[PDB]
From Swiss-Prot:
The chain holds residues 444 to 497 of 593 of the full protein. It is found in: Secreted, Cell wall. It comes from the Bacteria. It comes from Streptococcus sp. group G. This is Immunoglobulin G-binding protein G.
């Protein structure tokens, strides 16, 4: 569905919000594009917030 992501590492901050239809879809589909920008990091998304944080 509509989830937002925020990448946090040591010297790079990138966050994007895109329509993913579902959860794991946002987990698999979004993670690719979200990583497509800042793959270097790995995200940890919450359900309470509905946001993933790609941290490297």
């Amino acid at each position: 569905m509509y989830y937002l992501v925020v990448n946090k590492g040591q010297n790079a901050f990138y966050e994007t919000l895109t329509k993913a239809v579902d959860a794991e879809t946002a987990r698999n589909a979004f993670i690719q594009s979200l990583k497509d920008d800042g793959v270097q990091g790995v995200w940890t998304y919450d359900d309470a917030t509905k946001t993933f944080t790609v941290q490297a």
